[PDB]
Design a binder for this molecule. Structure first.
Ligand code: HEM
Ligand code: HEM
Ligand code: M4R
Ligand code: M4R
Ligand code: M4R
Ligand code: M4R
Ligand code: CL
Ligand code: CL
Ligand code: GD
Ligand code: GD
Ligand code: ZN
Ligand code: ZN
Ligand code: ZN
Lengths: 402, 404
């Protein structure tokens, strides 16, 4: 009674038994699948805490010992006394890592064990928040040799407002509306750019202005901080055989650092816990540069290549997009900033799938998200069947603080 | 009802149609399974329930709902099933149910054409020989010297007990698959077992790597018997590239007519184990899965080498460059040869239209996202950022076990 799953390219059969532990519930019924959707008490905080503890001890192969029982009785007594609880340092490391390990839409989870967890739970103000964040970037940017890190700020607690980062990423390019209904810069950031101005930012007028940070302390308005330019590593984009490419004046940042998700560990919730890895080239090349309501440079790049843009059948879209990905990959390599290509990443993901079958008897995977957005069937994940579901700890979306 | 967004526009719709879906999927609230290839695995009260279901949608379709001959049919079937344990469809009921099955095929991106489909009635077929003539006429009407035409030919229904009419082959036209001394295959590696069975039933194998198989056609209870397709019936296209002059030297080709012949057509609880249908190719089916899939013809690295690409490292995206050009050759070769084909951009753009249509006419449209998005340039097409609901309406095309 467990999902039989097949790799069709190879002929492999696994049974996802870990799915039987699916701590939460998704949007699919037997009458209808909604898999393509983008956005799908103390007795129970304890039940949430209890299980997480039982996991943490199962990991270090110390399950059901003296210290497992001591830790259990203590938490259930700290909730009883105060209404919440505190995780030990090593329970924070394990939790943050499990939340990476559990994230169904991440193709880069081969690396989950090697994450660097900065504990910022002693943080106190907006100005100090910024300090922790700059360290994060410095450590993670590492002069282009990217290291995966997560910083955790104080947990949500009754009686005190949340620490929150208002930017969706630590590094984002501005996006100004023009009178022609055109956006100069990144059209996805038109909103966050607004907020930045109405809180006092002097706006630039370029396609790649790096936005300031908006950092909110407990029960305090968000404060506007400027990242030091020297901290933000950027890659100018150029093609190895198309020299007219670099005169598009395109560039991207080195560090993908998502700052608007909520980490959830053993019932406790950390609304502000920015994490970062390194890029897969399709994210910059296809999503960021090609999407029609992103920078939307496909037709332009095609005209320069003298492809016949008058007809679909010429495949000018597909040709131009392959070359844009090529430029991305060549630029990052030239600048010695870590990048992985969709073939390498999906190849590593298959090994991850093998590791998790042996370790946990399975692995939550969201097929529609794991398959890269170009060249789907050329990768090995395409012909692999997957079971999507939800485990804890986890990274969650949360509503914008406005 | 499911609120479903087109993130490329932001448009929102509600999928009220999904509320009529009977046959349950493999998904529960605890685990999504929409990437499984065979979701739904593989007593006169139950037959009668579905039968009445199907008679009622027919009459609503033509406006004139209820009353009329509707009462007669119901009674006819009530009388029919009580008598014999089953019933027969009127020919118009069959043409209707035919199109609906197409219109409800969640994986098919070519559904805009659902209203133009040629239904051939072949329920008076009795032998394998008669089957062969019936099929030959299909291939001929369907091929039309290259200006393809949607068509389906339906054979007698599954009578209770006893053997069925059943095309053994997956498609009416396929290329043979021959093993050898290493473990490699010559021709199409997906068709080994049907080539395995044609040989051990009286076929004669071939030299090269595009040998057109015969048909193993079956009559009730009599074992299958082979039929050799007349080689002028089978229209093929040599594949050449517009600019890459050496491409044609690779000696590649694909047949014109995709004609699936191993699925089952259920209408009003009547199951037809033989019902071959055909349309025209989407270019990526030929260029991407048939030619580039690892255990298909797998020509990717040969093409990259001739293009002088660097196969040493993944980051040269050689796999991606070669693939695009193979699709360019597919398109150009079908067009020069004046055979109908559709590129994956045209098809998906028109699938969106279909979604718009189906929203007004029935308030929804079951679509399987992982099968609607083409296997290359996925995010470049308008279906990618369009959220979809998958579910199962009737009448339908369904998979069935193989006859062996
Ligand atoms: C180190 C190399 C990494 C690579 C190559 C990578 C790659 C990716 C990709 C391609 C996606 C899907 C993006 C999309 O929506 O299209 C994704 C999503 C995600 N990743 Fe990873 N990632 C990496 C590191 C990390 C780290 C360090 C974490 C957490 C600590 C993480 C957690 C997540 C989460 C939670 C999502 C879900 C966001 C969503 O719903 O799209 N990843 N990643
Ligand atoms: C006329 C142009 C047509 C085009 C371009 C087209 C295209 C496609 C494509 C690309 C698929 C997915 C193939 C795969 O990934 O396996 C598909 C699947 C399917 N189509 Fe269509 N189709 C057409 C006509 C038809 C017709 C005439 C019928 C039935 C009378 C039909 C019924 C189906 C069914 C039942 C599937 C199920 C998926 C499968 O079994 O592989 N289609 N079609
Ligand atoms: C489809 N793209 C649009 C912008 C939607 C999107 C939303 C969210 C969120 N929340 C997060 C998104 O990005 C996911 C993500 C998260 C973390 C990543 C890390 C750590 C590295 C990396 N290379 N990509 C990531 C990608 C995208
Ligand atoms: C976040 N800010 C941006 C402006 C919002 C957005 C923009 C675009 C575009 N163009 C496309 C968007 O959709 C993302 C999306 C939608 C559906 C997807 C499906 C079904 C699968 C998949 N792998 N990625 C998707 C990604 C969102
Ligand atoms: C999703 N079903 C799984 C992949 C089994 C399957 C295998 C093969 C092959 N080889 C071919 C298959 O059919 C694909 C198909 C079916 C019908 C088509 C029609 C009617 C038209 C068209 N242009 N392509 C089709 C392509 C299915
Ligand atoms: C077709 N007959 C052969 C013998 C079986 C097969 C072989 C190969 C290969 N190589 C690849 C195959 O892929 C099947 C498949 C599996 C998963 C798919 C998903 C998840 C989506 C999609 N659009 N097509 C799939 C198609 C099948
Ligand atoms: Cl990004
Ligand atoms: Cl095919
Ligand atoms: Gd050049
Ligand atoms: Gd040469
Ligand atoms: Zn996109
Ligand atoms: Zn589902
Ligand atoms: Zn394939």
């Amino acid at each position: 009674k467990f999902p039989r799953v097949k790799n069709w390219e190879v002929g492999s059969i696994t049974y996802d038994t870990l799915s039987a532990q699916a701590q939460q519930d998704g949007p699919c019924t037997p009458r209808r699948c909604l898999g393509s959707l983008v956005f799908p008490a103390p007795e129970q905080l304890l039940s949430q805490a209890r299980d997480f503890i039982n996991q943490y001890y199962s990991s270090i192969k110390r399950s059901g010992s003296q210290a497992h029982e001591q830790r259990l009785q203590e938490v259930e007594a700290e909730v009883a006394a105060t209404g919440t609880y505190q995780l030990r340092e090593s329970e924070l490391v394990f939790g943050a890592k499990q939340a990476w390990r559990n994230a169904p839409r991440c193709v880069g989870r081969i690396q989950w064990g090697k994450l660097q967890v900065f504990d910022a739970r002693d943080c106190r103000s907006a100005q100090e928040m910024f300090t922790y964040i700059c360290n994060h970037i410095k450590y993670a940017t590492n002069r282009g040799n990217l290291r995966s890190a997560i910083t955790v700020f104080p947990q949500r607690c009754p009686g005190r407002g949340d620490f929150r980062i208002w930017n969706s990423q630590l590094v984002r390019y501005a996006g100004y509306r023009q009178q022609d209904g055109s956006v100069r810069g990144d059209p996805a950031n038109v909103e966050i750019t607004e907020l930045c101005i109405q809180h006092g930012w002097t706006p630039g007028n370029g396609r790649f202005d790096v936005l300031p940070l908006l950092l909110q302390a407990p029960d305090e308005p968000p404060e506007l901080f400027l990242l030091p330019p020297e901290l933000v590593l950027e890659v100018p984009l150029e093609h190895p055989t198309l020299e007219w490419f670099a005169a598009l004046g395109l560039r991207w940042y080195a560090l993908p650092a998502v700052s608007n998700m909520l980490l959830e560990i053993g019932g406790l919730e950390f609304p502000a816990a920015p994490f970062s890895g390194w890029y897969m080239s399709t994210e910059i090349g296809t999503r960021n540069l090609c999407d029609p309501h992103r920078y939307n440079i496909l037709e332009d790049v095609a005209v320069c290549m003298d492809l016949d843009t008058r007809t679909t059948s010429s495949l000018w879209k597909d040709k131009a997009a392959v070359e844009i990905n090529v430029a991305v990959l060549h630029s990052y390599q030239l600048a010695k900033v870590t990048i992985v290509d969709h073939h390498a990443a999906t190849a590593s993901f298959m090994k991850h799938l093998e590791n998790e079958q042996k370790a946990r008897g399975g692995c939550p995977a969201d097929w529609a998200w794991i398959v890269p957005p170009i060249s789907g069937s050329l990768t090995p994940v395409f012909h692999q069947e997957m079971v999507n579901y939800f485990l804890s700890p986890a990274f969650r979306y949360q509503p914008d603080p406005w």
